Design a protein around this ligand. Structure first.
Ligand SMILES: CC(=O)SCCNC(=O)CCNC(=O)[C@H](O)C(C)(C)COP(=O)(O)OP(=O)(O)OC[C@H]1O[C@@H](n2cnc3c(N)ncnc32)[C@H](O)[C@@H]1OP(=O)(O)O
Ligand SMILES: O=P(O)(O)O[C@H]1[C@@H](OP(=O)(O)O)[C@@H](OP(=O)(O)O)[C@@H](OP(=O)(O)O)[C@@H](OP(=O)(O)O)[C@H]1OP(=O)(O)O
Ligand SMILES: [Zn+2]
Lengths: 335, 67
Protein backbone atom coordinates (compact mmCIF):
# COMPACT_ATOMS: atom_id res chain seq x y z
CA UNK A 1 0.00 0.00 0.00
CA UNK A 2 1.44 3.29 -1.24
CA UNK A 3 0.18 6.42 -2.98
CA UNK A 4 0.07 6.86 -6.72
CA UNK A 5 2.72 9.57 -6.38
CA UNK A 6 5.13 7.30 -4.54
CA UNK A 7 4.68 4.47 -7.04
CA UNK A 8 5.05 6.83 -9.98
CA UNK A 9 8.25 8.04 -8.34
CA UNK A 10 9.58 4.51 -7.91
CA UNK A 11 8.88 3.59 -11.54
CA UNK A 12 10.33 6.74 -13.18
CA UNK A 13 13.13 6.65 -10.63
CA UNK A 14 14.05 3.12 -11.66
CA UNK A 15 14.00 4.10 -15.30
CA UNK A 16 16.01 7.28 -14.65
CA UNK A 17 18.61 5.43 -12.63
CA UNK A 18 19.09 2.86 -15.39
CA UNK A 19 19.34 5.77 -17.81
CA UNK A 20 21.98 7.48 -15.67
CA UNK A 21 24.25 4.48 -15.59
CA UNK A 22 23.81 3.55 -19.27
CA UNK A 23 24.40 7.10 -20.40
CA UNK A 24 27.56 7.36 -18.28
CA UNK A 25 28.78 4.09 -19.77
CA UNK A 26 28.05 5.20 -23.32
CA UNK A 27 29.61 8.67 -22.91
CA UNK A 28 32.79 7.09 -21.60
CA UNK A 29 32.82 4.49 -24.38
CA UNK A 30 32.85 1.64 -21.86
CA UNK A 31 31.60 -1.87 -22.48
CA UNK A 32 28.97 -2.78 -19.87
CA UNK A 33 30.18 -6.37 -19.40
CA UNK A 34 33.76 -5.27 -18.71
CA UNK A 35 32.47 -2.49 -16.47
CA UNK A 36 30.55 -5.24 -14.61
CA UNK A 37 27.22 -3.50 -15.14
CA UNK A 38 24.46 -6.12 -15.07
CA UNK A 39 22.93 -5.40 -18.50
CA UNK A 40 20.97 -8.64 -18.62
CA UNK A 41 19.17 -7.90 -15.33
CA UNK A 42 18.42 -4.26 -16.12
CA UNK A 43 17.23 -5.00 -19.67
CA UNK A 44 15.01 -7.72 -18.29
CA UNK A 45 13.59 -5.32 -15.70
CA UNK A 46 12.99 -2.35 -17.99
CA UNK A 47 11.49 -4.27 -20.94
CA UNK A 48 7.86 -4.56 -19.62
CA UNK A 49 7.92 -0.85 -18.89
CA UNK A 50 9.23 -0.03 -22.36
CA UNK A 51 6.51 -2.21 -23.86
CA UNK A 52 3.73 -0.46 -21.94
CA UNK A 53 5.09 2.90 -23.00
CA UNK A 54 5.60 2.02 -26.64
CA UNK A 55 2.12 0.54 -26.80
CA UNK A 56 0.68 3.83 -25.56
CA UNK A 57 2.96 5.88 -27.82
CA UNK A 58 1.89 3.92 -30.95
CA UNK A 59 -1.77 2.81 -30.92
CA UNK A 60 -2.05 -0.45 -32.84
CA UNK A 61 1.47 -1.65 -32.10
CA UNK A 62 -0.16 -4.24 -29.85
CA UNK A 63 3.12 -5.53 -28.54
CA UNK A 64 3.02 -8.50 -26.20
CA UNK A 65 5.82 -10.30 -24.37
CA UNK A 66 5.74 -14.05 -25.00
CA UNK A 67 7.96 -16.94 -24.04
CA UNK A 68 8.58 -20.57 -25.01
CA UNK A 69 8.82 -23.87 -23.08
CA UNK A 70 12.53 -23.52 -22.28
CA UNK A 71 11.89 -20.13 -20.65
CA UNK A 72 10.01 -21.99 -17.89
CA UNK A 73 12.88 -24.41 -17.21
CA UNK A 74 14.98 -23.09 -14.30
CA UNK A 75 17.79 -25.47 -15.18
CA UNK A 76 18.36 -24.26 -18.75
CA UNK A 77 17.14 -20.71 -19.07
CA UNK A 78 19.57 -17.82 -18.70
CA UNK A 79 17.01 -15.91 -16.61
CA UNK A 80 13.25 -16.04 -15.94
CA UNK A 81 10.95 -14.52 -18.57
CA UNK A 82 10.23 -10.84 -18.03
CA UNK A 83 7.35 -9.73 -15.82
CA UNK A 84 3.95 -10.23 -17.45
CA UNK A 85 5.28 -12.60 -20.14
CA UNK A 86 2.81 -15.24 -21.38
CA UNK A 87 3.56 -18.69 -22.80
CA UNK A 88 3.08 -18.72 -26.59
CA UNK A 89 0.55 -21.58 -26.41
CA UNK A 90 -1.59 -19.78 -23.82
CA UNK A 91 -1.59 -16.67 -26.00
CA UNK A 92 -2.58 -18.51 -29.18
CA UNK A 93 -5.32 -20.35 -27.25
CA UNK A 94 -6.80 -17.32 -25.54
CA UNK A 95 -5.96 -13.98 -27.18
CA UNK A 96 -8.63 -11.92 -28.94
CA UNK A 97 -8.47 -11.97 -32.74
CA UNK A 98 -6.34 -9.22 -34.15
CA UNK A 99 -2.86 -8.16 -35.14
CA UNK A 100 -0.06 -8.28 -32.55
CA UNK A 101 3.64 -7.60 -32.31
CA UNK A 102 5.63 -9.73 -29.87
CA UNK A 103 9.00 -10.17 -28.30
CA UNK A 104 9.53 -13.88 -27.84
CA UNK A 105 11.90 -15.22 -25.21
CA UNK A 106 13.06 -18.78 -25.98
CA UNK A 107 14.79 -19.15 -22.64
CA UNK A 108 18.18 -17.86 -23.79
CA UNK A 109 17.42 -15.43 -26.61
CA UNK A 110 14.73 -12.92 -27.57
CA UNK A 111 13.30 -12.44 -31.08
CA UNK A 112 10.71 -10.17 -32.67
CA UNK A 113 7.43 -11.39 -34.19
CA UNK A 114 4.43 -10.11 -36.10
CA UNK A 115 1.34 -12.24 -35.33
CA UNK A 116 -2.04 -12.38 -37.01
CA UNK A 117 -4.84 -14.25 -35.28
CA UNK A 118 -8.36 -14.76 -36.56
CA UNK A 119 -11.13 -17.31 -36.72
CA UNK A 120 -9.38 -19.22 -39.47
CA UNK A 121 -6.13 -19.51 -37.55
CA UNK A 122 -2.84 -17.97 -36.44
CA UNK A 123 0.16 -16.96 -38.53
CA UNK A 124 3.47 -15.59 -37.30
CA UNK A 125 6.44 -13.94 -38.93
CA UNK A 126 9.48 -14.21 -36.67
CA UNK A 127 12.50 -11.96 -37.16
CA UNK A 128 15.62 -13.01 -35.20
CA UNK A 129 18.22 -10.24 -34.85
CA UNK A 130 20.92 -12.86 -34.39
CA UNK A 131 22.41 -14.98 -37.19
CA UNK A 132 25.21 -16.89 -35.57
CA UNK A 133 24.96 -20.34 -37.19
CA UNK A 134 27.81 -21.07 -39.63
CA UNK A 135 25.67 -23.77 -41.25
CA UNK A 136 22.46 -22.16 -42.57
CA UNK A 137 20.68 -25.54 -42.73
CA UNK A 138 20.61 -25.25 -38.91
CA UNK A 139 17.82 -22.71 -39.17
CA UNK A 140 15.45 -25.38 -40.50
CA UNK A 141 15.52 -26.68 -36.95
CA UNK A 142 14.91 -23.22 -35.47
CA UNK A 143 11.97 -22.63 -37.77
CA UNK A 144 10.45 -25.97 -36.84
CA UNK A 145 10.98 -25.17 -33.15
CA UNK A 146 9.08 -21.93 -33.26
CA UNK A 147 6.36 -23.51 -35.36
CA UNK A 148 5.77 -26.37 -33.01
CA UNK A 149 5.36 -23.99 -30.09
CA UNK A 150 2.71 -21.99 -31.95
CA UNK A 151 1.08 -25.30 -32.92
CA UNK A 152 1.30 -27.45 -36.08
CA UNK A 153 -1.57 -25.65 -37.75
CA UNK A 154 -0.17 -22.17 -37.26
CA UNK A 155 1.55 -20.82 -40.32
CA UNK A 156 5.07 -19.67 -39.53
CA UNK A 157 7.94 -17.84 -41.18
CA UNK A 158 11.34 -17.63 -39.51
CA UNK A 159 13.79 -14.91 -40.62
CA UNK A 160 17.26 -14.77 -39.07
CA UNK A 161 19.07 -11.47 -39.67
CA UNK A 162 22.70 -10.57 -39.01
CA UNK A 163 22.18 -7.59 -36.68
CA UNK A 164 23.23 -8.61 -33.18
CA UNK A 165 26.86 -9.23 -32.34
CA UNK A 166 26.79 -8.95 -28.52
CA UNK A 167 25.47 -11.46 -26.00
CA UNK A 168 22.86 -9.10 -24.48
CA UNK A 169 21.34 -6.74 -27.07
CA UNK A 170 18.58 -9.10 -28.33
CA UNK A 171 15.80 -7.55 -26.23
CA UNK A 172 16.27 -3.96 -27.39
CA UNK A 173 16.95 -5.07 -30.99
CA UNK A 174 13.74 -7.15 -30.97
CA UNK A 175 11.75 -4.28 -29.53
CA UNK A 176 13.06 -2.04 -32.32
CA UNK A 177 12.23 -4.69 -34.94
CA UNK A 178 8.67 -4.90 -33.60
CA UNK A 179 8.30 -1.14 -33.91
CA UNK A 180 9.46 -1.40 -37.52
CA UNK A 181 7.00 -4.26 -38.19
CA UNK A 182 4.21 -2.01 -37.02
CA UNK A 183 5.68 0.70 -39.27
CA UNK A 184 5.56 -1.73 -42.21
CA UNK A 185 2.21 -3.16 -41.11
CA UNK A 186 0.96 -3.56 -44.71
CA UNK A 187 4.00 -5.46 -46.02
CA UNK A 188 3.92 -7.93 -43.16
CA UNK A 189 0.14 -8.32 -43.60
CA UNK A 190 0.78 -9.18 -47.25
CA UNK A 191 3.27 -11.84 -46.18
CA UNK A 192 0.79 -13.23 -43.62
CA UNK A 193 -1.84 -13.56 -46.34
CA UNK A 194 0.69 -15.36 -48.52
CA UNK A 195 1.63 -17.78 -45.70
CA UNK A 196 -2.02 -18.58 -45.05
CA UNK A 197 -2.84 -19.14 -48.74
CA UNK A 198 0.29 -21.25 -49.22
CA UNK A 199 1.37 -18.95 -52.04
CA UNK A 200 4.70 -18.08 -53.65
CA UNK A 201 6.79 -16.13 -51.07
CA UNK A 202 9.47 -15.12 -53.59
CA UNK A 203 7.55 -11.92 -54.27
CA UNK A 204 7.95 -10.89 -50.60
CA UNK A 205 11.41 -12.09 -49.67
CA UNK A 206 14.58 -13.03 -51.59
CA UNK A 207 15.39 -16.49 -50.19
CA UNK A 208 12.71 -18.78 -48.77
CA UNK A 209 11.82 -22.47 -48.55
CA UNK A 210 9.45 -24.71 -46.57
CA UNK A 211 10.86 -27.08 -43.98
CA UNK A 212 10.24 -30.79 -44.42
CA UNK A 213 8.89 -31.62 -40.97
CA UNK A 214 6.56 -28.71 -40.14
CA UNK A 215 6.30 -26.91 -43.48
CA UNK A 216 7.45 -23.69 -41.79
CA UNK A 217 8.75 -21.05 -44.20
CA UNK A 218 12.46 -20.55 -43.51
CA UNK A 219 13.61 -17.22 -44.93
CA UNK A 220 17.38 -17.11 -45.32
CA UNK A 221 17.16 -13.68 -46.93
CA UNK A 222 14.28 -11.43 -45.90
CA UNK A 223 14.88 -8.44 -48.14
CA UNK A 224 12.89 -6.53 -49.33
CA UNK A 225 10.51 -7.25 -46.43
CA UNK A 226 13.47 -6.83 -44.12
CA UNK A 227 14.34 -3.50 -45.36
CA UNK A 228 17.06 -0.83 -44.77
CA UNK A 229 15.19 0.65 -41.79
CA UNK A 230 15.19 -2.76 -40.09
CA UNK A 231 18.96 -3.00 -40.41
CA UNK A 232 19.67 0.38 -38.74
CA UNK A 233 20.99 -1.10 -35.47
CA UNK A 234 23.29 -3.65 -37.08
CA UNK A 235 26.33 -3.71 -34.81
CA UNK A 236 28.98 -4.79 -37.33
CA UNK A 237 29.69 -2.45 -40.24
CA UNK A 238 30.58 -5.61 -42.21
CA UNK A 239 27.02 -6.98 -41.74
CA UNK A 240 25.45 -3.75 -42.93
CA UNK A 241 27.69 -3.44 -45.99
CA UNK A 242 27.14 -7.14 -46.82
CA UNK A 243 23.39 -6.47 -46.69
CA UNK A 244 23.67 -3.40 -48.89
CA UNK A 245 26.00 -5.20 -51.29
CA UNK A 246 23.37 -7.94 -51.57
CA UNK A 247 20.49 -5.46 -52.01
CA UNK A 248 21.81 -2.28 -53.70
CA UNK A 249 18.28 -0.84 -53.97
CA UNK A 250 18.40 -0.51 -50.17
CA UNK A 251 21.53 1.64 -50.28
CA UNK A 252 19.85 4.83 -51.49
CA UNK A 253 16.77 5.10 -49.29
CA UNK A 254 16.79 7.55 -46.37
CA UNK A 255 16.42 5.66 -43.08
CA UNK A 256 15.55 8.79 -41.08
CA UNK A 257 14.51 12.44 -41.40
CA UNK A 258 18.18 13.52 -41.45
CA UNK A 259 18.23 11.91 -44.90
CA UNK A 260 21.05 9.50 -44.02
CA UNK A 261 21.33 6.24 -45.95
CA UNK A 262 21.91 3.06 -44.00
CA UNK A 263 25.63 3.12 -44.81
CA UNK A 264 26.04 6.75 -43.69
CA UNK A 265 24.06 6.36 -40.48
CA UNK A 266 26.01 3.24 -39.54
CA UNK A 267 29.37 4.89 -40.15
CA UNK A 268 28.31 7.86 -37.97
CA UNK A 269 27.71 5.43 -35.07
CA UNK A 270 31.07 3.62 -35.34
CA UNK A 271 33.09 3.47 -32.13
CA UNK A 272 36.23 1.61 -31.20
CA UNK A 273 36.58 -0.12 -27.86
CA UNK A 274 37.52 -2.98 -25.60
CA UNK A 275 35.14 -5.87 -25.06
CA UNK A 276 35.64 -9.35 -23.62
CA UNK A 277 37.66 -11.53 -25.99
CA UNK A 278 35.34 -14.14 -27.45
CA UNK A 279 35.76 -16.79 -30.12
CA UNK A 280 35.00 -15.83 -33.74
CA UNK A 281 32.94 -17.66 -36.40
CA UNK A 282 35.27 -20.68 -36.60
CA UNK A 283 35.63 -20.61 -32.83
CA UNK A 284 39.12 -19.15 -32.73
CA UNK A 285 40.10 -16.76 -29.93
CA UNK A 286 43.40 -15.03 -29.15
CA UNK A 287 44.91 -14.82 -25.67
CA UNK A 288 44.00 -12.12 -23.19
CA UNK A 289 40.66 -11.35 -21.60
CA UNK A 290 39.88 -8.50 -24.00
CA UNK A 291 39.97 -7.41 -27.65
CA UNK A 292 39.45 -4.03 -29.29
CA UNK A 293 36.77 -3.85 -31.94
CA UNK A 294 35.03 -1.32 -34.09
CA UNK A 295 31.26 -1.52 -34.11
CA UNK A 296 28.13 0.59 -34.32
CA UNK A 297 26.83 2.31 -31.15
CA UNK A 298 23.28 2.39 -32.42
CA UNK A 299 21.63 -0.09 -30.08
CA UNK A 300 23.16 1.60 -27.01
CA UNK A 301 21.75 4.92 -28.06
CA UNK A 302 18.43 3.22 -28.83
CA UNK A 303 18.19 1.78 -25.31
CA UNK A 304 18.83 5.21 -23.87
CA UNK A 305 16.23 6.89 -26.13
CA UNK A 306 13.61 4.25 -25.28
CA UNK A 307 14.27 4.72 -21.55
CA UNK A 308 13.86 8.52 -21.94
CA UNK A 309 10.52 7.96 -23.74
CA UNK A 310 9.28 5.54 -21.10
CA UNK A 311 10.22 7.84 -18.18
CA UNK A 312 8.44 10.67 -19.94
CA UNK A 313 5.38 8.49 -20.45
CA UNK A 314 5.25 7.40 -16.82
CA UNK A 315 5.65 10.97 -15.57
CA UNK A 316 2.21 11.86 -16.91
CA UNK A 317 0.39 8.52 -17.08
CA UNK A 318 -3.02 8.03 -15.40
CA UNK A 319 -3.06 6.18 -12.01
CA UNK A 320 -4.11 2.77 -13.30
CA UNK A 321 -1.17 2.76 -15.68
CA UNK A 322 1.15 3.76 -12.87
CA UNK A 323 -0.18 0.92 -10.70
CA UNK A 324 0.22 -1.64 -13.51
CA UNK A 325 3.81 -0.49 -14.17
CA UNK A 326 4.67 -0.48 -10.48
CA UNK A 327 3.47 -4.11 -10.24
CA UNK A 328 5.49 -5.06 -13.34
CA UNK A 329 8.66 -3.54 -11.84
CA UNK A 330 8.00 -5.11 -8.44
CA UNK A 331 7.50 -8.53 -10.05
CA UNK A 332 10.70 -7.98 -12.11
CA UNK A 333 12.90 -7.18 -9.11
CA UNK A 334 11.70 -10.39 -7.45
CA UNK A 335 14.50 -12.17 -9.35
CA UNK B 1 36.28 -31.98 -28.79
CA UNK B 2 35.58 -35.70 -28.96
CA UNK B 3 31.82 -35.45 -28.53
CA UNK B 4 29.81 -38.60 -29.11
CA UNK B 5 26.16 -39.44 -28.46
CA UNK B 6 24.04 -42.54 -28.88
CA UNK B 7 21.29 -40.15 -30.01
CA UNK B 8 20.17 -37.82 -32.81
CA UNK B 9 19.84 -34.06 -32.32
CA UNK B 10 18.59 -30.87 -34.03
CA UNK B 11 19.63 -27.29 -33.22
CA UNK B 12 17.71 -25.08 -30.78
CA UNK B 13 20.11 -22.23 -30.11
CA UNK B 14 23.63 -20.89 -30.29
CA UNK B 15 24.58 -17.84 -28.29
CA UNK B 16 27.40 -16.02 -26.54
CA UNK B 17 27.28 -16.17 -22.75
CA UNK B 18 28.05 -13.69 -19.94
CA UNK B 19 31.59 -14.15 -18.67
CA UNK B 20 32.60 -16.76 -21.24
CA UNK B 21 34.92 -16.70 -24.23
CA UNK B 22 33.00 -19.59 -25.76
CA UNK B 23 29.38 -19.73 -27.01
CA UNK B 24 26.77 -22.18 -25.76
CA UNK B 25 24.97 -24.51 -28.16
CA UNK B 26 21.44 -25.77 -27.48
CA UNK B 27 20.06 -29.00 -28.96
CA UNK B 28 16.78 -30.94 -28.66
CA UNK B 29 16.00 -34.49 -29.86
CA UNK B 30 15.40 -35.29 -33.53
CA UNK B 31 12.24 -37.10 -32.38
CA UNK B 32 10.80 -34.19 -30.40
CA UNK B 33 7.95 -33.77 -32.87
CA UNK B 34 7.29 -37.33 -34.03
CA UNK B 35 7.56 -38.90 -30.57
CA UNK B 36 7.15 -35.97 -28.17
CA UNK B 37 10.66 -36.70 -26.85
CA UNK B 38 11.70 -34.09 -24.28
CA UNK B 39 15.44 -34.78 -24.26
CA UNK B 40 17.64 -31.69 -24.66
CA UNK B 41 21.35 -31.02 -24.39
CA UNK B 42 23.63 -28.02 -23.90
CA UNK B 43 27.22 -27.88 -25.08
CA UNK B 44 29.84 -25.32 -24.07
CA UNK B 45 33.64 -25.33 -24.34
CA UNK B 46 35.05 -24.68 -20.87
CA UNK B 47 36.17 -21.15 -20.02
CA UNK B 48 38.84 -22.14 -17.49
CA UNK B 49 40.25 -25.15 -19.38
CA UNK B 50 39.93 -24.62 -23.15
CA UNK B 51 40.55 -28.33 -23.73
CA UNK B 52 37.47 -29.43 -21.77
CA UNK B 53 33.90 -29.61 -23.11
CA UNK B 54 30.97 -29.17 -20.73
CA UNK B 55 27.78 -30.99 -21.66
CA UNK B 56 24.44 -31.04 -19.85
CA UNK B 57 21.67 -33.49 -20.73
CA UNK B 58 18.12 -32.82 -19.57
CA UNK B 59 15.07 -35.13 -19.54
CA UNK B 60 15.05 -38.73 -20.75
CA UNK B 61 14.46 -40.04 -24.26
CA UNK B 62 11.06 -41.73 -24.66
CA UNK B 63 12.28 -44.08 -27.38
CA UNK B 64 15.12 -46.55 -28.05
CA UNK B 65 18.49 -45.51 -29.49
CA UNK B 66 18.31 -44.69 -33.24
CA UNK B 67 19.60 -47.95 -34.74
O1 LIG C 1 34.25 -11.59 -38.37
P1 LIG C 1 33.28 -12.80 -37.56
O2 LIG C 1 34.29 -13.89 -37.30
O3 LIG C 1 32.18 -12.93 -38.54
O4 LIG C 1 32.67 -12.10 -36.24
P2 LIG C 1 33.89 -11.38 -35.31
O5 LIG C 1 33.46 -11.84 -33.96
O6 LIG C 1 35.22 -11.81 -35.86
O7 LIG C 1 33.66 -9.75 -35.37
C1 LIG C 1 32.72 -9.56 -36.41
C2 LIG C 1 32.07 -8.19 -36.27
O8 LIG C 1 31.22 -8.15 -35.10
C3 LIG C 1 31.61 -7.04 -34.32
N1 LIG C 1 31.51 -7.47 -32.93
C4 LIG C 1 32.14 -8.57 -32.34
N2 LIG C 1 31.87 -8.70 -31.02
C5 LIG C 1 31.03 -7.61 -30.76
C6 LIG C 1 30.42 -7.17 -29.58
N3 LIG C 1 30.59 -7.86 -28.40
N4 LIG C 1 29.65 -6.05 -29.57
C7 LIG C 1 29.53 -5.41 -30.78
N5 LIG C 1 30.03 -5.69 -31.99
C8 LIG C 1 30.81 -6.83 -31.95
C9 LIG C 1 33.13 -6.73 -34.62
O9 LIG C 1 33.42 -5.40 -34.40
C10 LIG C 1 33.16 -7.05 -36.16
O10 LIG C 1 32.75 -5.96 -36.83
P3 LIG C 1 33.46 -5.78 -38.51
O11 LIG C 1 33.23 -7.19 -38.96
O12 LIG C 1 32.62 -4.67 -39.11
O13 LIG C 1 34.89 -5.49 -38.10
O1 LIG D 1 10.01 8.55 -37.42
P1 LIG D 1 10.29 7.11 -36.96
O2 LIG D 1 10.45 6.24 -38.20
O3 LIG D 1 9.00 6.64 -36.27
O4 LIG D 1 11.70 7.01 -35.88
C1 LIG D 1 11.78 7.50 -34.61
C2 LIG D 1 12.39 8.89 -34.40
O5 LIG D 1 11.55 9.92 -34.73
P2 LIG D 1 11.41 11.37 -33.87
O6 LIG D 1 12.43 11.44 -32.72
O7 LIG D 1 11.66 12.60 -34.77
O8 LIG D 1 10.00 11.56 -33.29
C3 LIG D 1 13.87 9.06 -35.02
O9 LIG D 1 13.90 9.49 -36.28
P3 LIG D 1 14.64 10.91 -36.89
O10 LIG D 1 14.24 12.17 -36.10
O11 LIG D 1 16.18 10.83 -36.91
O12 LIG D 1 14.23 11.12 -38.34
C4 LIG D 1 14.79 7.73 -34.80
O13 LIG D 1 15.62 7.52 -35.89
P4 LIG D 1 17.29 7.68 -35.88
O14 LIG D 1 17.92 6.76 -34.84
O15 LIG D 1 17.95 7.37 -37.25
O16 LIG D 1 17.71 9.13 -35.55
C5 LIG D 1 14.17 6.37 -34.20
O17 LIG D 1 14.21 5.39 -35.06
P5 LIG D 1 15.31 4.09 -35.23
O18 LIG D 1 15.19 2.99 -34.17
O19 LIG D 1 15.03 3.47 -36.59
O20 LIG D 1 16.79 4.52 -35.25
C6 LIG D 1 12.68 6.72 -33.60
O21 LIG D 1 12.02 5.66 -32.98
P6 LIG D 1 10.92 4.57 -33.69
O22 LIG D 1 11.40 4.16 -35.08
O23 LIG D 1 10.79 3.29 -32.89
O24 LIG D 1 9.52 5.18 -33.91
ZN1 LIG E 1 14.76 -38.46 -28.05
Amino acid sequence: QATVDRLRTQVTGFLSGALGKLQALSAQNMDPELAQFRVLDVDRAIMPLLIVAENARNPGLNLVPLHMDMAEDEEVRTQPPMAGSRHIAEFVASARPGRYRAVIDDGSHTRAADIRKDASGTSVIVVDPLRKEKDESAYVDYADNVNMEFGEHAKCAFIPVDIQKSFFDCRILSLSLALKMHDKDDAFAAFHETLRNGGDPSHHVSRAQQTEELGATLVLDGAPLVDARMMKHGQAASSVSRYLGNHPEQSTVPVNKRNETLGERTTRHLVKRKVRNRADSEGRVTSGETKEITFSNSVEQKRIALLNRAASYVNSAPPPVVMRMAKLLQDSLLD
Amino acid sequence: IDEGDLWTWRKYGQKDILGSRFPRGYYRCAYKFTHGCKATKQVQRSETDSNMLAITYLSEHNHPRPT
